């Protein structure tokens, strides 16, 4: 019943916006868009960071630089503190994914450590652009420019969610559709460590049939775009692979120090 | 119309017959130990490897292997010859799609660069099963389990074939699907290099339709089979790399070791 479908694609839109504060239909207004009425602080250089922290409302550290840690350690670890945040709010998304919950609890938890990473790019691209992504709730904006001047390490780490971003959003998705993908991406049945691949898999094959109608009504002109969103999930998954990857080579640069037991802590992995 | 896909459809099933000496349906005649018009010489251990030049066209060393190139070297510089076998023809096969041949001539070798090996490890799953793949048009099956226990590096470049080919021929797809899906892996567009990409999305466009409609013909009950499918290409890229890893690390290991032209090529870094 295509009443299902179309059903299941505003539940799951619904669920989107009462979970993630930053929706495309925000970001894009005040990226690239318009939208003269609050105009986000820019960051570009090594001053707009600095006179831009004790000035914007960022959660980690103050503004100091003068043989105090360095700026690109600051900003990484800050975009950890805000994926962490994301993976609540993903979390909670997923719950309201119909039959999600019903699953054994040990898929859950395996079907959230491992699409997490994914979806957190999917959306990231939302708030992004070929100059730069939206920072801190969308208050800022952190040009792609700064982002490349940072130490050698922290200064790749981004690229490959540019380029990916600027292809993706050409697909000119809004978060109708983001929202379908998104759940079509957290129940994957690949996913390592599954104990009950069936359940999971039906839901998806459910919400894929539901991304293909949206789609088709939403983008009657688009075509074949059903094919293509699927096949940016190979990019995903290489955009989350390259990262672990950039991940160790960070992991051996900074490591011993008797203050971070409780702060490393909070951030495992994802 | 799907008149025009459905032509399509033959027209792609056509040439792959036409390019393709070993189709999965004579493969599966094959592995299926019934027809016995012809069956299999099996190898699963040095033993058997030695009665390999017996019964099958080989022009290698047929005694012991210790004193010049073991059997690791043997059975590998035999599946490069494939390789270059399997280009060529997909090499053929390609120039049959509607339009790739009218591409920048540019476009047409980095189509044939990067769609090669995704296409090859596909196919190479129609030869394959649980235990073993075919090898020598159909004449011999080789087992998987002689294949895992070949020396250090050599030991582990099949695996990874072997379990991507368990769960796509679960897909339980036949000759004129493959067709489409080749022909939809070739004209990418993502690939990196590419001049004019909208012609080559446009003919993928068509491609994909053309899948579409096939699969819902020819697989009416198999829910989502399109998608799933679709999502198989990033199994496949995955692989790829793990491969180039692999060779690298034999290039080093056996400074001996000849990859061969038309492979090097193809083949690069990052
Ligand atoms: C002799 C080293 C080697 C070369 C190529 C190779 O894989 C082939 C492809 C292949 C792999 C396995 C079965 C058939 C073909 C390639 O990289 O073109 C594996 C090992």
């Given at each position: 019943?295509?009443?299902?479908?179309?059903?299941?694609?505003?539940?799951?839109?619904?669920?989107?916006?009462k979970s993630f504060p930053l929706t495309k239909?925000?970001?894009?207004?005040?990226?690239?868009?318009?939208?003269?009425?609050?105009?986000?602080?820019?960051?570009?250089?090594?001053?707009?960071l600095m006179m831009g922290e004790d000035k914007?409302?960022?959660?980690?550290?103050?503004?100091?630089?003068?043989?105090?840690?360095?700026?690109?350690?600051?900003?990484?670890?800050?975009?950890?503190?805000?994926?962490?945040?994301?993976?609540?709010?993903?979390?909670?998304?997923?719950?309201?994914?119909?039959?999600?919950?019903?699953?054994?609890?040990?898929?859950?938890?395996?079907?959230?450590?491992?699409?997490?990473?994914?979806?957190?790019?999917?959306?990231?691209?939302?708030?992004?652009?070929?100059?730069?992504?939206?920072?801190?709730?969308?208050?800022?904006?952190?040009?792609?420019?700064?982002?490349?001047?940072?130490?050698?390490?922290?200064?790749?780490?981004?690229?490959?969610?540019?380029?990916?971003?600027?292809?993706?959003?050409?697909?000119?998705?809004?978060?109708?559709?983001?929202?379908?993908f998104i759940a079509v991406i957290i129940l994957?049945?690949?996913?390592?460590?599954?104990?009950?691949?069936?359940?999971?898999?039906?839901?998806?094959?459910?919400?894929?049939?539901?991304?293909?109608?949206?789609?088709?009504?939403?983008?009657?002109?688009?075509?074949?775009?059903?094919?293509?969103?699927?096949?940016?999930?190979?990019?995903?998954?290489?955009?989350?692979?390259?990262?672990?990857?950039?991940?160790?080579?960070?992991?051996?640069?900074?490591?011993?120090?008797?203050?971070?037991?409780?702060?490393?802590?909070?951030?495992?992995?994802?």
């Amino acid at each position: 019943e295509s009443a299902d479908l179309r059903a299941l694609a505003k539940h799951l839109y619904d669920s989107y916006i009462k979970s993630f504060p930053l929706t495309k239909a925000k970001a894009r207004a005040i990226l690239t868009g318009k939208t003269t009425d609050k105009s986000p602080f820019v960051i570009y250089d090594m001053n707009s960071l600095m006179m831009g922290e004790d000035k914007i409302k960022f959660k980690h550290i103050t503004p100091l630089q003068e043989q105090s840690k360095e700026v690109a350690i600051r900003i990484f670890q800050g975009c950890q503190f805000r994926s962490v945040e994301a993976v609540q709010e993903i979390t909670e998304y997923a719950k309201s994914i119909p039959g999600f919950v019903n699953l054994d609890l040990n898929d859950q938890v395996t079907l959230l450590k491992y699409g997490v990473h994914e979806i957190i790019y999917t959306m990231l691209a939302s708030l992004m652009n070929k100059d730069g992504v939206l920072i801190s709730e969308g208050q800022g904006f952190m040009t792609r420019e700064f982002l490349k001047s940072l130490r050698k390490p922290f200064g790749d780490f981004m690229e490959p969610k540019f380029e990916f971003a600027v292809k993706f959003n050409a697909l000119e998705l809004d978060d109708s559709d983001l929202a379908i993908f998104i759940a079509v991406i957290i129940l994957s049945g690949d996913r390592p460590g599954l104990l009950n691949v069936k359940p999971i898999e039906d839901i998806q094959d459910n919400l894929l049939q539901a991304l293909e109608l949206q789609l088709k009504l939403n983008h009657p002109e688009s075509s074949q775009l059903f094919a293509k969103l699927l096949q940016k999930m190979t990019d995903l998954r290489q955009i989350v692979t390259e990262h672990v990857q950039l991940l160790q080579v960070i992991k051996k640069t900074e490591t011993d120090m008797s203050l971070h037991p409780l702060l490393q802590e909070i951030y495992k992995d994802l």
